[PDB]
Design an enzyme around this catalytic site. Structure first.
Site, PDB file in Angstrom:
ATOM      1  N   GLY A 270     -56.065  47.248 -17.464  1.00  0.00           N
ATOM      2  CA  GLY A 270     -56.360  45.827 -16.892  1.00  0.00           C
ATOM      3  C   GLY A 270     -54.848  45.147 -15.758  1.00  0.00           C
ATOM      4  O   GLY A 270     -54.426  43.974 -15.174  1.00  0.00           O
ATOM      5  N   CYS A 271     -54.160  46.344 -15.415  1.00  0.00           N
ATOM      6  CA  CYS A 271     -52.600  46.238 -14.884  1.00  0.00           C
ATOM      7  C   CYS A 271     -52.284  46.690 -13.259  1.00  0.00           C
ATOM      8  O   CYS A 271     -53.013  47.814 -12.947  1.00  0.00           O
ATOM      9  CB  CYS A 271     -50.865  47.301 -15.753  1.00  0.00           C
ATOM     10  SG  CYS A 271     -49.735  46.262 -15.146  1.00  0.00           S
ATOM     11  N   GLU A 272     -51.659  46.219 -13.205  1.00  0.00           N
ATOM     12  CA  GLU A 272     -51.192  45.747 -10.896  1.00  0.00           C
ATOM     13  C   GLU A 272     -50.861  47.553 -10.494  1.00  0.00           C
ATOM     14  O   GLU A 272     -51.540  47.877 -10.113  1.00  0.00           O
ATOM     15  CB  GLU A 272     -49.788  45.221 -10.698  1.00  0.00           C
ATOM     16  CG  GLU A 272     -49.991  44.942  -8.937  1.00  0.00           C
ATOM     17  CD  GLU A 272     -50.962  45.146  -8.053  1.00  0.00           C
ATOM     18  OE1 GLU A 272     -50.866  43.323  -8.116  1.00  0.00           O
ATOM     19  OE2 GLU A 272     -51.807  45.594  -8.802  1.00  0.00           O
TER      20      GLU A 272
END
Length: 140
Positions: A53-55
């Site tokens: 889910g991360c940048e």
């Protein structure tokens, strides 16, 4: 290992973070808090789950002392998220699976005022990190 849940506590985070009202400063403190998250050995990066889910990339893994208590480890590429991981580690480290299904793992972030002006994708990674923690509690 990391200092979170032992040397850095919810209590010390409250004292660092409760006075803080401006987001520039909350973020300054998260970044500094992230710098006490050690670099995770490659061994253990290879064994962690990669949070989708991360940048930037984020690792979360765990062990369990058969005395019940659960012990987490992780790493992050970006400076802010390293700090958010640190805060999570603080909530969640040293806990039984029982204890973790009781509380919302993101409860600490709410009581430190580290959600309001979070980027949209930050929240996802967060949520993902919580869901990931919940899974480990169930699997023991």
């Amino acid at each position: 290992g990391h200092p979170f849940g032992t040397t850095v506590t919810a209590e010390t985070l409250r004292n660092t973070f409760a006075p803080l009202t401006q987001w520039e400063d909350k973020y300054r403190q998260l970044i500094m808090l992230g710098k006490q998250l050690p670099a995770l050995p490659d061994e253990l990066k290879a064994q962690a789950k990669e949070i989708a889910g991360c940048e930037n990339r984020v690792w979360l893994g765990y062990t369990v002392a058969e005395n019940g208590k659960m012990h987490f480890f992780g790493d992050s590429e970006g400076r802010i998220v390293r700090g958010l991981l640190a805060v999570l580690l603080t909530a969640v480290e040293g806990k039984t699976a029982a204890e973790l299904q009781a509380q919302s793992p993101l409860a600490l972030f709410d009581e430190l005022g580290l959600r309001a002006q979070l980027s949209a994708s930050r929240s996802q990674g967060l949520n993902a990190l919580s869901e990931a923690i919940i899974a480990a509690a169930k699997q023991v």
